[PDB]
Design a protein around this ligand. Structure first.
Ligand SMILES: O=C(O)c1ccc(COc2ccc(F)c(Cl)c2)o1
Ligand SMILES: O=C(O)c1ccc(COc2ccc(F)c(Cl)c2)o1
Lengths: 163, 163
């Protein structure tokens, strides 16, 4: 609840279990980590007054997923932008000090109506916490934007912690 | 419509653009390809009489995503099992002979209620085509199973081809 932004090094520390400590929420390490920094996190405000995350991923043409997805037609997998939103909701639950390992539990409607090309500069994630329930889980809405343009929406993202 | 099963080599050929030809549907190449084989594909039968895919991914402890997701807590990313279902619906649209590049457009409800651990042997995907629309797109329901046990469901998977 004290720290409201996180550098890449903080997120890498998180991925090693060294931010929330052993048995608690971990981000993936590269190459599954789909966030470079958390610009903002809070447990108040946002769309529902239950908190907000703003996070960023820098794009360059050499990110691994461009070469294989697809050959001659590079586009950041939609599933990985979706996963960034699950990664962030899991981070939020750990950041609130809850114990346990994070799992995505699913979502309501997901829409992909644009793409991240290797010519893009920056992807921004906006997460609005809707509800937490203490079987500890969070429900959230999320958007993915590239260089100012909204391209994905997700309603009812669900993440749980397992102890 | 003639070939009803596909080996890993066929899928790798598909990823290089060499199965449906240039500008048509491509699977991802490794390490984004989340299918080893298509056991069955048809444009008739399934839950809605509009066709079915059955596909498999062999699991071993050395698959790349176990090491980074998460460190000390290996589990196949749910987002990649979801992506296998988008990959298969895209394959179906190309297999029917439609032109254009594949994009996931989203889904209705996704649920993850189990996990793929590095001790699992085989993941099976079952896709039921619900509807196609000719702006060419397919709508489908999907399940992910590990060693006989259903663990994920997705309703209203959507994939489109872009010409
Ligand atoms: O991994 C994918 O399939 C993926 C990433 C992003 C998308 C969506 O692609 C597009 C791309 C352009 C469009 F206009 C629309 Cl309606 C969707 O699909
Ligand atoms: O990438 C993930 O977060 C991921 C993959 C699979 C899952 C779901 O994990 C579980 C694992 C055990 C359970 F009992 C439930 Cl209801 C969900 O989450």
């Amino acid at each position: 609840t004290k720290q409201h932004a996180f550098t890449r090094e903080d997120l890498l520390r998180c991925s090693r279990g060294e931010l929330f400590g052993p048995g608690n929420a971990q981000l993936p390490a590269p190459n599954m980590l789909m966030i470079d920094r958390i610009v903002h996190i809070s447990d108040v405000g946002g769309k529902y007054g239950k908190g907000e995350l703003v996070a960023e991923l820098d794009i360059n043409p050499d990110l691994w997923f461009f070469a294989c997805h697809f050959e001659g037609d590079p586009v950041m997998p939609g599933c990985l932008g979706l996963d960034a939103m699950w990664q962030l909701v899991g981070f939020y639950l750990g950041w609130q000090g809850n114990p346990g390992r994070g799992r995505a539990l699913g979502s309501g409607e997901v829409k992909f109506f644009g793409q991240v090309l290797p010519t893009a500069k920056k992807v921004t994630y906006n997460i609005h916490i809707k509800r937490t329930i203490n079987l500890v889980l969070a429900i959230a809405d999320g958007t993915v934007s590239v260089d100012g343009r909204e391209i994905y929406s997700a309603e009812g993202l669900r993440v749980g912690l397992f102890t």
